[PDB]
Short mmCIF file of C-alpha atoms and ligand atoms in Angstrom, two decimals:
data_model
loop_
_atom_site.label_atom_id
_atom_site.label_comp_id
_atom_site.label_asym_id
_atom_site.label_seq_id
_atom_site.Cartn_x
_atom_site.Cartn_y
_atom_site.Cartn_z
CA UNK W 29 154.19 -101.05 113.13
CA UNK W 30 157.67 -99.56 112.82
CA UNK W 31 159.53 -96.32 112.27
CA UNK W 32 159.82 -94.45 108.97
CA UNK W 33 162.80 -94.98 106.78
CA UNK W 34 166.02 -93.57 108.11
CA UNK W 35 168.65 -91.95 105.96
CA UNK W 36 172.15 -93.45 105.87
CA UNK W 37 174.54 -91.81 108.31
CA UNK W 38 178.02 -91.82 106.78
CA UNK W 39 179.58 -89.55 109.42
CA UNK W 40 178.09 -90.61 112.66
CA UNK W 41 178.58 -87.66 114.97
CA UNK W 42 177.26 -85.11 112.46
CA UNK W 43 174.23 -86.92 111.15
CA UNK W 44 173.16 -84.85 108.15
CA UNK W 45 173.94 -81.45 109.61
CA UNK W 46 176.19 -80.50 106.68
CA UNK W 47 174.11 -81.33 103.59
CA UNK W 48 171.13 -80.01 105.52
CA UNK W 49 172.90 -76.77 106.40
CA UNK W 50 174.13 -76.53 102.82
CA UNK W 51 171.02 -76.91 100.70
CA UNK W 52 168.07 -78.22 102.74
CA UNK W 53 165.83 -78.20 99.69
CA UNK W 54 168.00 -80.43 97.50
CA UNK W 55 168.77 -82.63 100.50
CA UNK W 56 165.33 -83.23 101.96
CA UNK W 57 164.16 -83.81 98.40
CA UNK W 58 166.94 -86.33 97.92
CA UNK W 59 165.93 -88.14 101.09
CA UNK W 60 162.35 -88.16 99.88
CA UNK W 61 163.24 -89.42 96.41
CA UNK W 62 165.84 -92.01 97.40
CA UNK W 63 164.07 -93.36 100.48
CA UNK W 64 161.06 -93.69 98.16
CA UNK W 65 159.06 -92.18 101.03
CA UNK W 66 157.77 -88.63 101.56
CA UNK W 67 157.91 -89.37 105.26
CA UNK W 68 161.30 -90.20 106.69
CA UNK W 69 163.78 -89.72 109.51
CA UNK W 70 167.10 -87.90 109.48
CA UNK W 71 169.64 -87.32 112.24
CA UNK W 72 171.12 -84.09 113.60
CA UNK W 73 173.97 -84.54 116.07
CA UNK W 74 172.38 -87.95 116.63
CA UNK W 75 168.91 -86.57 117.29
CA UNK W 76 166.22 -88.39 115.31
CA UNK W 77 164.40 -85.85 113.14
CA UNK W 78 161.39 -87.23 111.33
CA UNK W 79 160.30 -85.01 108.47
CA UNK W 80 156.67 -85.36 107.42
CA UNK W 81 157.20 -84.53 103.76
CA UNK W 82 154.03 -85.91 102.16
CA UNK W 83 151.36 -83.23 101.87
CA UNK W 84 148.43 -85.61 102.23
CA UNK W 85 149.80 -86.24 105.74
CA UNK W 86 149.97 -82.65 106.94
CA UNK W 87 146.92 -83.23 109.12
CA UNK W 88 148.81 -85.87 111.08
CA UNK W 89 151.34 -83.31 112.21
CA UNK W 90 149.27 -80.19 112.90
CA UNK W 91 146.33 -81.93 114.57
CA UNK W 92 147.65 -83.60 117.72
CA UNK W 93 147.53 -81.41 120.85
CA UNK W 94 150.66 -79.93 122.44
CA UNK W 95 150.88 -82.72 124.98
CA UNK W 96 151.45 -85.35 122.32
CA UNK W 97 153.46 -83.19 119.93
CA UNK W 98 155.05 -80.46 121.99
CA UNK W 99 156.27 -77.09 120.67
CA UNK W 100 157.89 -76.02 123.89
CA UNK W 101 161.15 -77.96 123.67
CA UNK W 102 161.72 -77.01 120.09
CA UNK W 103 161.44 -73.31 120.90
CA UNK W 104 163.50 -73.04 124.11
CA UNK W 105 166.04 -71.36 121.89
CA UNK W 106 163.90 -68.28 122.31
CA UNK W 107 163.34 -68.19 126.07
CA UNK W 108 166.02 -65.49 126.28
CA UNK W 109 164.09 -63.51 123.68
CA UNK W 110 160.61 -63.98 125.17
CA UNK W 111 161.58 -64.64 128.78
CA UNK W 112 161.14 -67.36 131.36
CA UNK W 113 157.49 -68.40 131.60
CA UNK W 114 156.62 -66.56 128.41
CA UNK W 115 154.85 -68.31 125.54
CA UNK W 116 155.80 -71.97 125.13
CA UNK W 117 158.21 -71.68 128.02
CA UNK W 118 155.00 -71.09 129.94
CA UNK W 119 152.59 -73.91 130.78
CA UNK W 120 150.38 -74.64 127.80
CA UNK W 121 147.19 -73.29 129.36
CA UNK W 122 148.91 -69.95 129.91
CA UNK W 123 150.83 -69.92 126.68
CA UNK W 124 147.53 -70.25 124.95
CA UNK W 125 146.02 -67.39 126.95
CA UNK W 126 149.04 -65.23 126.14
CA UNK W 127 148.97 -66.04 122.42
CA UNK W 128 145.22 -65.39 122.46
CA UNK W 129 145.67 -61.93 123.96
CA UNK W 130 148.18 -61.19 121.23
CA UNK W 131 145.86 -62.60 118.59
CA UNK W 132 143.00 -60.30 119.60
CA UNK W 133 145.32 -57.31 119.22
CA UNK W 134 145.90 -58.45 115.65
CA UNK W 135 142.38 -59.15 114.43
CA UNK W 136 141.03 -57.05 111.54
CA UNK W 137 139.00 -54.97 113.99
CA UNK W 138 142.28 -53.25 114.86
CA UNK W 139 143.38 -52.70 111.27
CA UNK W 140 141.04 -49.76 110.58
CA UNK W 141 143.83 -47.18 110.99
CA UNK W 142 146.62 -49.29 109.55
CA UNK W 143 146.45 -49.08 105.74
CA UNK W 144 146.72 -45.28 105.86
CA UNK W 145 149.42 -45.33 108.55
CA UNK W 146 151.41 -47.89 106.58
CA UNK W 147 151.11 -45.98 103.28
CA UNK W 148 152.33 -42.90 105.13
CA UNK W 149 155.55 -44.45 106.44
CA UNK W 150 156.26 -46.02 103.07
CA UNK W 151 155.94 -42.70 101.27
CA UNK W 152 158.07 -41.15 104.00
CA UNK W 153 160.85 -43.70 103.69
CA UNK W 154 160.71 -43.53 99.89
CA UNK W 155 160.99 -39.75 99.70
CA UNK W 156 163.74 -39.66 102.36
CA UNK W 157 165.61 -42.52 100.69
CA UNK W 158 164.51 -42.80 97.07
CA UNK W 159 165.07 -39.08 96.66
CA UNK W 160 166.31 -39.12 93.06
CA UNK W 161 164.55 -39.91 89.77
CA UNK W 162 166.65 -43.04 89.45
CA UNK W 163 168.95 -44.85 91.82
CA UNK W 164 170.04 -48.22 93.10
CA UNK W 165 169.02 -49.63 96.46
CA UNK W 166 169.17 -52.90 98.34
CA UNK W 167 165.60 -54.19 98.21
CA UNK W 168 165.95 -56.67 101.08
CA UNK W 169 167.70 -54.06 103.20
CA UNK W 170 165.33 -51.18 102.65
CA UNK W 171 162.22 -53.29 102.89
CA UNK W 172 163.44 -54.44 106.25
CA UNK W 173 163.46 -50.79 107.22
CA UNK W 174 160.06 -50.05 105.73
CA UNK W 175 158.62 -53.03 107.61
CA UNK W 176 159.89 -52.21 111.10
CA UNK W 177 158.79 -48.64 110.45
CA UNK W 178 155.28 -49.38 109.22
CA UNK W 179 154.74 -51.97 111.96
CA UNK W 180 155.53 -49.66 114.87
CA UNK W 181 153.52 -46.96 113.13
CA UNK W 182 150.56 -49.38 113.34
CA UNK W 183 150.90 -51.14 116.70
CA UNK W 184 152.79 -48.46 118.60
CA UNK W 185 151.15 -45.55 120.39
CA UNK W 186 152.44 -42.05 119.71
CA UNK W 187 154.31 -41.73 123.01
CA UNK W 188 156.02 -45.12 122.69
CA UNK W 189 157.04 -44.38 119.11
CA UNK W 190 158.48 -41.21 120.62
CA UNK W 191 160.74 -42.75 123.28
CA UNK W 192 161.47 -45.66 120.97
CA UNK W 193 161.70 -45.28 117.20
CA UNK W 194 161.60 -47.96 114.55
CA UNK W 195 165.25 -47.69 113.60
CA UNK W 196 166.44 -47.93 117.21
CA UNK W 197 164.04 -50.79 117.97
CA UNK W 198 165.42 -52.78 115.03
CA UNK W 199 168.84 -52.59 116.66
CA UNK W 200 167.27 -54.22 119.71
CA UNK W 201 165.86 -56.91 117.39
CA UNK W 202 169.25 -57.56 115.78
CA UNK W 203 170.99 -57.29 119.15
CA UNK W 204 168.52 -59.61 120.88
CA UNK W 205 168.70 -62.02 117.94
CA UNK W 206 172.37 -62.19 117.03
CA UNK W 207 172.87 -64.14 120.25
CA UNK W 208 170.85 -67.09 118.97
CA UNK W 209 171.98 -70.57 117.95
CA UNK W 210 169.85 -72.50 115.48
CA UNK W 211 171.67 -75.73 116.29
CA UNK W 212 170.52 -75.22 119.86
CA UNK W 213 167.09 -76.55 118.95
CA UNK W 214 168.47 -79.98 118.28
CA UNK W 215 171.23 -79.69 120.86
CA UNK W 216 170.25 -77.37 123.72
CA UNK W 217 172.98 -78.66 125.91
CA UNK W 218 174.69 -75.87 124.01
CA UNK W 219 172.26 -73.72 125.84
CA UNK W 220 173.77 -74.47 129.19
CA UNK W 221 175.72 -71.49 130.48
CA UNK W 222 177.65 -67.19 125.60
CA UNK W 223 179.14 -63.68 125.52
CA UNK W 224 176.64 -61.52 123.60
CA UNK W 225 173.98 -63.80 125.06
CA UNK W 226 174.03 -61.16 127.74
CA UNK W 227 173.25 -58.71 124.98
CA UNK W 228 169.96 -60.34 124.24
CA UNK W 229 169.68 -59.88 127.96
CA UNK W 230 170.77 -56.30 127.67
CA UNK W 231 168.79 -55.72 124.52
CA UNK W 232 165.70 -57.03 126.26
CA UNK W 233 166.16 -55.57 129.70
CA UNK W 234 166.73 -52.18 128.11
CA UNK W 235 163.50 -52.47 126.15
CA UNK W 236 161.53 -53.79 129.12
CA UNK W 237 162.47 -50.81 131.29
CA UNK W 238 161.56 -48.50 128.41
CA UNK W 239 158.04 -49.89 128.55
CA UNK W 240 157.98 -50.01 132.35
CA UNK W 241 158.76 -46.32 132.07
CA UNK W 242 156.25 -45.82 129.28
CA UNK W 243 153.43 -47.18 131.42
CA UNK W 244 153.95 -44.88 134.39
CA UNK W 245 153.62 -42.08 131.83
CA UNK W 246 150.21 -43.04 130.42
CA UNK W 247 148.69 -43.79 133.82
CA UNK W 248 149.18 -40.19 134.90
CA UNK W 249 147.17 -38.84 131.95
CA UNK W 250 144.01 -40.86 132.57
CA UNK W 251 142.50 -38.31 134.97
CA UNK W 252 142.75 -35.89 132.07
CA UNK W 253 141.69 -38.57 129.63
CA UNK W 254 144.32 -36.70 127.67
CA UNK W 255 144.83 -39.54 125.20
CA UNK W 256 142.71 -42.63 124.51
CA UNK W 257 145.66 -44.75 123.42
CA UNK W 258 144.85 -48.28 122.28
CA UNK W 259 148.07 -49.52 120.70
CA UNK W 260 149.28 -53.10 120.94
CA UNK W 261 150.88 -52.29 124.30
CA UNK W 262 147.57 -50.78 125.37
CA UNK W 263 145.52 -53.90 124.63
CA UNK W 264 148.09 -56.15 126.32
CA UNK W 265 147.88 -54.20 129.59
CA UNK W 266 144.06 -54.39 129.64
CA UNK W 267 144.06 -58.17 129.18
CA UNK W 268 143.24 -60.43 132.12
CA UNK W 269 144.13 -64.09 132.62
CA UNK W 270 141.23 -66.29 133.68
CA UNK W 271 142.58 -66.63 137.17
CA UNK W 272 141.91 -62.89 137.39
CA UNK W 273 145.56 -61.90 137.27
CA UNK W 274 147.34 -59.74 134.73
CA UNK W 275 150.55 -59.71 132.76
CA UNK W 276 153.64 -58.64 134.66
CA UNK W 277 155.85 -56.14 132.84
CA UNK W 278 158.11 -59.02 131.84
CA UNK W 279 155.28 -60.91 130.14
CA UNK W 280 154.04 -57.79 128.38
CA UNK W 281 157.51 -56.97 127.11
CA UNK W 282 157.82 -60.61 126.12
CA UNK W 283 154.62 -60.62 124.09
CA UNK W 284 155.48 -57.44 122.17
CA UNK W 285 159.04 -58.55 121.53
CA UNK W 286 157.64 -61.82 120.22
CA UNK W 287 155.17 -59.90 118.07
CA UNK W 288 157.71 -57.61 116.41
CA UNK W 289 160.56 -60.10 116.11
CA UNK W 290 157.92 -62.36 114.55
CA UNK W 291 156.91 -59.88 111.86
CA UNK W 292 160.27 -58.42 111.20
CA UNK W 293 162.06 -60.88 109.03
CA UNK W 294 159.27 -63.02 107.74
CA UNK W 295 157.47 -59.97 106.51
CA UNK W 296 160.39 -58.12 104.99
CA UNK W 297 161.45 -61.30 103.17
CA UNK W 298 158.00 -61.94 101.77
CA UNK W 299 157.83 -58.32 100.67
CA UNK W 300 161.23 -58.77 99.07
CA UNK W 301 160.48 -61.94 97.06
CA UNK W 302 157.13 -60.55 95.88
CA UNK W 303 158.61 -57.32 94.52
CA UNK W 304 161.56 -59.21 93.07
CA UNK W 305 159.37 -61.65 91.18
CA UNK W 306 156.98 -59.01 89.87
CA UNK W 307 159.86 -56.74 88.77
CA UNK W 308 161.31 -59.56 86.66
CA UNK W 309 160.73 -59.26 82.90
CA UNK W 310 159.35 -62.77 82.49
CA UNK W 311 156.59 -61.75 84.90
CA UNK W 312 155.47 -58.72 82.88
CA UNK W 313 151.94 -60.05 82.47
CA UNK W 314 151.83 -60.64 86.22
CA UNK W 315 152.98 -57.05 86.67
CA UNK W 316 150.47 -55.93 84.03
CA UNK W 317 147.75 -57.78 85.92
CA UNK W 318 148.77 -56.30 89.29
CA UNK W 319 148.34 -52.86 87.75
CA UNK W 320 144.81 -53.45 86.44
CA UNK W 321 144.02 -53.96 90.15
CA UNK W 322 145.67 -50.95 91.83
CA UNK W 323 145.40 -48.35 89.06
CA UNK W 324 141.82 -47.41 89.91
CA UNK W 325 142.63 -46.84 93.55
CA UNK W 326 142.80 -43.42 95.13
CA UNK W 327 146.33 -42.47 96.12
CA UNK W 328 145.17 -42.57 99.71
CA UNK W 329 144.23 -46.17 100.34
CA UNK W 330 141.88 -47.62 102.84
CA UNK W 331 141.08 -51.05 104.07
CA UNK W 332 138.50 -51.80 101.42
CA UNK W 333 141.26 -51.15 98.94
CA UNK W 334 143.49 -53.72 100.55
CA UNK W 335 141.93 -56.95 101.83
CA UNK W 336 138.73 -57.00 99.87
CA UNK W 337 139.97 -55.43 96.65
CA UNK W 338 143.43 -56.96 96.08
CA UNK W 339 142.81 -60.68 95.63
CA UNK W 340 145.45 -61.02 92.93
CA UNK W 341 148.19 -59.15 94.73
CA UNK W 342 147.50 -61.42 97.69
CA UNK W 343 147.95 -64.33 95.27
CA UNK W 344 151.41 -63.01 94.46
CA UNK W 345 152.34 -62.74 98.13
CA UNK W 346 151.14 -66.24 98.97
CA UNK W 347 152.71 -67.75 95.85
CA UNK W 348 155.97 -66.13 96.95
CA UNK W 349 155.62 -67.63 100.42
CA UNK W 350 154.88 -70.86 98.56
CA UNK W 351 158.08 -70.85 96.52
CA UNK W 352 160.44 -69.60 99.24
CA UNK W 353 158.86 -70.19 102.67
CA UNK W 354 160.74 -67.93 105.08
CA UNK W 355 160.31 -70.58 107.77
CA UNK W 356 161.62 -73.85 106.36
CA UNK W 357 160.47 -76.08 109.16
CA UNK W 358 157.76 -76.42 111.76
CA UNK W 359 158.91 -78.73 114.55
CA UNK W 360 157.68 -80.49 117.68
CA UNK W 361 158.81 -82.78 120.43
CA UNK W 362 157.11 -86.11 120.07
CA UNK W 363 156.14 -86.75 123.65
CA UNK W 364 154.14 -89.81 122.68
CA UNK W 365 153.85 -92.15 119.69
CA UNK W 366 151.94 -90.74 116.72
CA UNK W 367 150.65 -92.32 113.54
CA UNK W 368 151.91 -90.62 110.40
CA UNK W 369 150.82 -92.45 107.26
CA UNK W 370 151.83 -96.09 107.35
CA UNK W 371 154.50 -95.17 109.92
CA UNK W 372 154.72 -94.68 113.66
CA UNK W 373 156.92 -92.04 115.26
CA UNK W 374 158.58 -92.78 118.58
CA UNK W 375 158.29 -90.81 121.80
CA UNK W 376 161.48 -88.76 121.97
CA UNK W 377 161.85 -88.10 118.27
CA UNK W 378 161.69 -84.70 116.69
CA UNK W 379 158.84 -84.37 114.27
CA UNK W 380 158.84 -81.62 111.74
CA UNK W 381 156.73 -80.52 108.84
CA UNK W 382 158.46 -78.46 106.18
CA UNK W 383 156.79 -75.71 104.15
CA UNK W 384 160.00 -75.86 102.16
CA UNK W 385 159.69 -79.54 101.30
CA UNK W 386 155.93 -79.59 100.92
CA UNK W 387 155.77 -76.56 98.63
CA UNK W 388 158.02 -78.52 96.23
CA UNK W 389 156.12 -81.80 96.21
CA UNK W 390 155.42 -82.31 92.50
CA UNK W 391 151.86 -83.67 92.92
CA UNK W 392 150.87 -80.62 94.95
CA UNK W 393 152.83 -78.02 92.96
CA UNK W 394 153.93 -78.85 89.44
CA UNK W 395 157.11 -77.00 88.56
CA UNK W 396 157.63 -75.83 92.10
CA UNK W 397 160.46 -73.41 91.24
CA UNK W 398 158.10 -71.61 88.87
CA UNK W 399 156.49 -68.65 90.62
CA UNK W 400 152.88 -68.77 89.44
CA UNK W 401 150.54 -66.79 91.69
CA UNK W 402 147.63 -68.13 89.66
CA UNK W 403 148.55 -71.74 90.42
CA UNK W 404 146.58 -73.64 93.03
CA UNK W 405 147.76 -76.28 95.46
CA UNK W 406 146.57 -79.41 93.66
CA UNK W 407 146.60 -81.14 97.02
CA UNK W 408 144.38 -79.78 99.76
CA UNK W 409 146.32 -78.46 102.73
CA UNK W 410 149.62 -78.57 100.88
CA UNK W 411 150.53 -74.89 101.33
CA UNK W 412 151.74 -74.36 104.95
CA UNK W 413 153.41 -70.98 104.57
CA UNK W 414 151.62 -69.92 107.74
CA UNK W 415 151.54 -73.27 109.48
CA UNK W 416 148.20 -74.84 110.27
CA UNK W 417 145.92 -76.17 112.99
CA UNK W 418 146.13 -74.79 116.51
CA UNK W 419 149.37 -72.89 116.20
CA UNK W 420 148.64 -71.45 112.82
CA UNK W 421 150.02 -67.98 112.43
CA UNK W 422 147.99 -65.16 113.94
CA UNK W 423 150.19 -62.53 112.37
CA UNK W 424 148.86 -63.84 109.09
CA UNK W 425 146.28 -61.18 108.15
CA UNK W 426 148.38 -58.29 109.43
CA UNK W 427 151.45 -59.27 107.43
CA UNK W 428 149.36 -59.66 104.28
CA UNK W 429 148.09 -56.17 105.06
CA UNK W 430 151.57 -54.70 105.14
CA UNK W 431 153.08 -56.45 102.14
CA UNK W 432 150.08 -55.84 99.94
CA UNK W 433 149.80 -52.24 101.05
CA UNK W 434 153.52 -51.68 100.48
CA UNK W 435 153.39 -53.55 97.16
CA UNK W 436 150.63 -51.15 96.16
CA UNK W 437 152.27 -47.88 97.16
CA UNK W 438 155.61 -48.98 95.75
CA UNK W 439 154.62 -50.12 92.26
CA UNK W 440 152.09 -47.29 92.00
CA UNK W 441 154.66 -44.52 92.54
CA UNK W 442 157.67 -46.28 91.04
CA UNK W 443 159.13 -48.67 88.53
CA UNK W 444 161.80 -51.25 89.16
CA UNK W 445 164.45 -53.39 87.53
CA UNK W 446 166.43 -56.34 88.79
CA UNK W 447 170.14 -55.79 88.46
CA UNK W 448 170.63 -59.46 87.75
CA UNK W 449 169.55 -61.91 85.06
CA UNK W 450 167.61 -64.07 87.50
CA UNK W 451 165.75 -63.63 90.78
CA UNK W 452 168.02 -64.17 93.81
CA UNK W 453 168.90 -67.62 95.07
CA UNK W 454 167.42 -68.25 98.47
CA UNK W 455 169.93 -67.94 101.30
CA UNK W 456 169.24 -70.90 103.56
CA UNK W 457 171.99 -69.86 105.96
CA UNK W 458 169.77 -67.50 107.91
CA UNK W 459 167.41 -68.81 110.62
CA UNK W 460 164.65 -67.06 108.67
CA UNK W 461 165.30 -67.68 105.00
CA UNK W 462 165.16 -64.81 102.52
CA UNK W 463 166.53 -63.95 99.11
CA UNK W 464 170.31 -63.58 99.07
CA UNK W 465 171.08 -60.15 100.56
CA UNK W 466 174.03 -59.23 98.31
CA UNK W 467 171.83 -60.16 95.32
CA UNK W 468 168.94 -57.83 96.17
CA UNK W 469 170.38 -54.67 94.61
CA UNK W 470 167.70 -53.06 92.42
CA UNK W 471 167.28 -49.94 90.27
CA UNK W 472 164.24 -47.81 91.11
CA UNK W 473 162.86 -45.56 88.38
CA UNK W 474 160.50 -42.94 89.81
CA UNK W 475 157.28 -42.29 87.92
CA UNK W 476 155.54 -39.19 86.60
CA UNK W 477 153.00 -38.25 83.94
C1 HEM C 4 155.29 -63.75 105.95
C2 HEM C 4 154.93 -63.46 107.19
C3 HEM C 4 154.81 -64.58 108.10
C4 HEM C 4 155.12 -65.88 107.93
C5 HEM C 4 155.68 -66.52 106.70
C6 HEM C 4 154.81 -66.51 109.14
C7 HEM C 4 154.97 -67.88 109.30
C8 HEM C 4 154.48 -68.50 110.40
C9 HEM C 4 154.48 -69.88 110.57
C10 HEM C 4 154.99 -70.85 109.54
C11 HEM C 4 153.94 -70.13 111.78
C12 HEM C 4 153.75 -71.48 112.35
C13 HEM C 4 155.09 -71.92 112.92
C14 HEM C 4 154.76 -72.75 114.12
O1 HEM C 4 154.15 -73.82 113.97
O2 HEM C 4 155.05 -72.36 115.26
C15 HEM C 4 153.58 -68.93 112.39
C16 HEM C 4 153.04 -68.75 113.65
C17 HEM C 4 153.10 -67.50 114.25
N1 HEM C 4 153.35 -66.32 113.69
FE1 HEM C 4 153.72 -66.04 111.92
N2 HEM C 4 154.28 -65.65 109.98
C18 HEM C 4 154.27 -64.46 109.45
C19 HEM C 4 153.88 -63.23 109.91
C20 HEM C 4 153.75 -63.01 111.24
C21 HEM C 4 153.60 -61.77 111.84
C22 HEM C 4 153.53 -60.49 111.07
C23 HEM C 4 153.53 -62.01 113.20
C24 HEM C 4 153.30 -61.07 114.29
C25 HEM C 4 152.53 -60.01 114.11
C26 HEM C 4 153.63 -63.40 113.39
C27 HEM C 4 153.58 -64.04 114.60
C28 HEM C 4 153.38 -65.40 114.65
C29 HEM C 4 153.08 -66.02 115.92
C30 HEM C 4 153.00 -65.30 117.23
C31 HEM C 4 152.92 -67.33 115.69
C32 HEM C 4 152.62 -68.37 116.74
C33 HEM C 4 151.41 -69.18 116.30
C34 HEM C 4 150.71 -69.83 117.45
O3 HEM C 4 151.21 -70.81 118.04
O4 HEM C 4 149.60 -69.41 117.80
N3 HEM C 4 153.73 -63.99 112.17
N4 HEM C 4 153.93 -67.94 111.52
O1 LFD C 5 160.15 -70.10 114.94
C1 LFD C 5 160.67 -69.09 115.38
N1 LFD C 5 161.99 -68.98 115.41
C2 LFD C 5 162.84 -69.89 114.90
C3 LFD C 5 163.35 -70.94 115.64
C4 LFD C 5 164.25 -71.83 115.08
C5 LFD C 5 164.71 -71.72 113.79
N2 LFD C 5 165.59 -72.59 113.26
C6 LFD C 5 166.05 -72.46 111.87
C7 LFD C 5 167.52 -72.76 111.69
N3 LFD C 5 167.97 -73.94 112.43
C8 LFD C 5 168.86 -74.80 111.88
C9 LFD C 5 168.84 -75.01 110.52
C10 LFD C 5 169.73 -75.85 109.90
C11 LFD C 5 170.69 -76.51 110.62
CL1 LFD C 5 171.78 -77.55 109.87
C12 LFD C 5 170.71 -76.31 111.97
CL2 LFD C 5 171.79 -77.07 112.76
C13 LFD C 5 169.82 -75.47 112.60
C14 LFD C 5 167.54 -74.05 113.82
C15 LFD C 5 166.07 -73.75 114.01
C16 LFD C 5 164.21 -70.66 113.08
C17 LFD C 5 163.31 -69.76 113.62
O2 LFD C 5 159.90 -68.14 115.94
C18 LFD C 5 158.93 -67.28 115.31
C19 LFD C 5 158.23 -67.81 114.08
N4 LFD C 5 157.42 -66.87 113.37
C20 LFD C 5 157.77 -65.80 112.75
C21 LFD C 5 156.70 -65.27 112.22
N5 LFD C 5 155.67 -66.05 112.46
C22 LFD C 5 156.15 -67.03 113.19
C23 LFD C 5 158.05 -67.04 116.34
C24 LFD C 5 157.11 -67.98 116.69
C25 LFD C 5 156.23 -67.79 117.72
C26 LFD C 5 156.31 -66.64 118.44
CL3 LFD C 5 155.33 -66.43 119.62
C27 LFD C 5 157.26 -65.71 118.11
C28 LFD C 5 158.13 -65.88 117.07
CL4 LFD C 5 159.20 -64.79 116.72
#
C-alpha cells in the first residue's frame, strides 16, 4: 500500500549520482543488500528512480503498455539523433509502426546474404590490419571497426556504401553521439537550449542529404531495372504506414541512424568481451569446446553454419552479455501507479529494470562474476540482456549473427593472448558500457599449418 524502500540521501541535491556514476554494480547491489529489498528507490538530482532489482519481478516492468510505463520521456535524450517525431518522440501508434518496419528489415529472411558478406569484410580488415604473423592491436578499437564495416556491408546497398563508407559513417556516429548527455534523461531541463549539439545536427543533416541524394539516384535506374537493390534503405522506402502515407526523408534517415547507432557499440562491446573471455587461459576448455564446433566448417561460411550450427558459441555471446550487459538499465516514465511485488510505484517516478543488477542476483546466477557460458539462469526471465516484452530488442538475431560469425572467422584464422593477467574491468563511464578501452590491447598470433 506504500512505496518501496528509499535509500538514504546524505547529500540532498545530488541524490546518489556519484556512487551510481562511480560503480553502479557495487552500489545498486549495496542498496539491494542493505535495504533488504531487491526492489527499491534511489534519487538522481532529486528524481525518484525505482529500480526493479528482483528477477522474479521482471514481468511487472516489461508487461505494462507504454501508456502506463512510458519509454518516450526516458529517451528524449535521443530526439536530436533520431529526429522530431521519430521513434518514441513519435506518438506510440506510429513509433510502433516505425519500429515494426525496421524489425521486418532485420528478420532472418534478410540474412541470407549476410554471413558471407560479414566474413568477407572481416577477412579484409584482418589482412589490411593484422598484416604480420604476430602483432598487438586494440581489440575493442578494431572490433568497433569490423562491426561498422560488416554492418554496412550487410544492410547497405552497393551505391550507398559507395557514397558513404563504413569508416566515414562511424565518424557521423561519434559526431552525432558525442553531443549527448546521459544525465539529461533524469534532468532534461539540461536539454533546454550546447555547442557541438549542432554537430549532431550537422552530423545528421549531412547524412540525411546524402540519402536524399542517394534516392534520386536509384529512382532513375528503375526504367532500366539496372539494379534490384533491397538494402535496409530499400525496404524502408517501400514501407507504408496504415494511413497510406510513407516515411519522409527525415523519418527514413532517422530509422537507419537509429539502426546503426543501435548496433554499433552494443555489438562491438559484446564481440569484445566474448573474444576476451575465450582468449583467457582459464577458459581454455571453453576455447577448446568452441573449436570442436567451428573446425569442421568450410572456410566460406553460410547461414546454416551460423545460427543453426553454433549453439555453444551463441552461449558464449549471451553469457558475456549476461556478465557485462552493455546497457545497464532499461527505464520508463511511470505515468500511472503500478504494482511491483509487495510495493506500489507512484505516477511520476522513474522505473527501471537493470540487466546489470539482475544478472548479478545470486539466486538467478551463482557466482555472477564467473563467466560460464554453460550456466543457465536459475530463475526464469532473469537474463534481460536484450530487454523483454514489447520493446524487446529486434536487433537481437542480427547482432548474434555478426558476433558469432566474427568469432568464427577470427579464432579460425588466428590465435590470441590477453596482454594482462585478468580480463578488463568494465568501464561504466560510457553510456554504453564495454570493457575498459586502454585495457583491451591484445597480441594476435596468425595461424598456419
Ligand atoms: C549486443 C547487442 C545488443 C544489445 C546488448 C542490445 C540491447 C538491447 C536492449 C537491452 C534493448 C531494450 C532496451 C529498451 O527497453 O529500450 C534493445 C532494444 C532495441 N535494440 Fe538492441 N541490442 C543489441 C543489438 C542491437 C542491434 C544490432 C540493433 C539494430 C540492428 C538494435 C536495435 C535495437 C532497437 C531498435 C531496440 C528497440 C526495441 C523496441 O522498442 O522495439 N539492437 N536492445
Ligand atoms: O538506450 C539507448 N540509448 C541510451 C540512452 C541512455 C543511456 N544512459 C546511460 C548513462 N546515463 C547515466 C548513467 C549514470 C549516471 Cl550517474 C547518469 Cl547521471 C546518467 C544516462 C542514460 C544509455 C543509452 O538507445 C539504444 C539502445 N539500444 C542499443 C542497441 N539496442 C538497443 C537505442 C534504442 C532504441 C532505438 Cl530505436 C535506438 C537506439 Cl540506438
